[PDB]
Amino acid sequence: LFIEWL
């Protein structure tokens, strides 16, 4: 599981 916010 991977999550990124930028």
Numbering used by the authors: 1 to 6
What text appears in the publication on this structure?
Two polymorphic crystal forms could be grown from solutions of APRex-4. In the case of polymorph A, side chains presented an unusually high degree of flexibility. The hydrophobic core is formed by Leu1 and Leu6 while intrasheet H-bonds of Glu-Glu side chains stabilize the interface. The weak residual electron density around the side chains of Trp5 suggests that additional conformers of this side chain are also present in the otherwise close-packed crystals. Tryptophan of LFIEWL (polymorph A) adopts different conformational states, (opaque and transparent side chains) having multiple geometries of aromatic interactions. However, the exact geometry of the cluster in polymorph A is ambiguous due to the elevated internal mobility of the Trp side chain. At pHs where Glu/Asp side chains become protonated, charge frustration ceases as side chains establish intersheet H-bonds. In the presence of organic solvents, the exendin-like structures adopted more compact crystal forms, in which opposing side chains of the steric zippers interact with each other.
Here, we identify an evolutionarily conserved hexapeptide sequence as the major aggregation-prone region (APR) of gastrointestinal peptides of the glucagon family: xFxxWL. We determine nine polymorphic crystal structures of the APR segments of glucagon-like peptides 1 and 2, and exendin and its derivatives. We propose that the pH-dependent changes of the protonation states of glutamate/aspartate residues of APRs initiate switching between the amyloid and the folded, monomeric forms of the hormones. Our results highlight the dual role of short aggregation core motifs in reversible amyloid formation and receptor binding.
